[PDB]
Amino acid sequence: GSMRMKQLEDKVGELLFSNYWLELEVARLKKLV
Amino acid sequence: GSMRMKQLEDKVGELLFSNYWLELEVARLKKLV
């Protein structure tokens, strides 16, 4: 129905992915400092 | 307006801000190790 909505849905998924990996990186760094 | 579109936009905005916050935190921590 809505290609606009698909694009935003996709971006939510991409950002959830990126944020997961950034959180993991922060946690690894907290174990290192 | 569209509740679905605005909810998507809102979630993208929140995730983008968190992403940026996390990148700043990674950079802060990387300076130390």
The Cα–Cα gap between B23 and B6 comes to 26
CA distance linking residue B5 with residue B27, whole number of Å: 33
Name the token pair of A11. Answer: 């971006």
SS (HEC) of chain B: CCHHHHHHHHHHHHHHHHHHHHHHHHHHHHCCC
Measured between CA atoms, the residue of chain A closest to residue B25 is: A26
Q: Is the dihedral of CA B33, A17, A2, B13 positive or negative?
A: negative
Positive or negative, the CA dihedral A10, A23, B32, B20 is positive
Q: What is the experimental resolution, given in Å to one decimal place?
A: 1.2
Chain B environment of A4 (Cβ under 8 Å): 5
This structure was determined by X-ray
Contact A29, B33 (CB under 8 A): yes
N-to-C CA span, chain A: 49
Yes or no: say if B2 and A3 are a contact pair by the CB < 8 Å rule: no
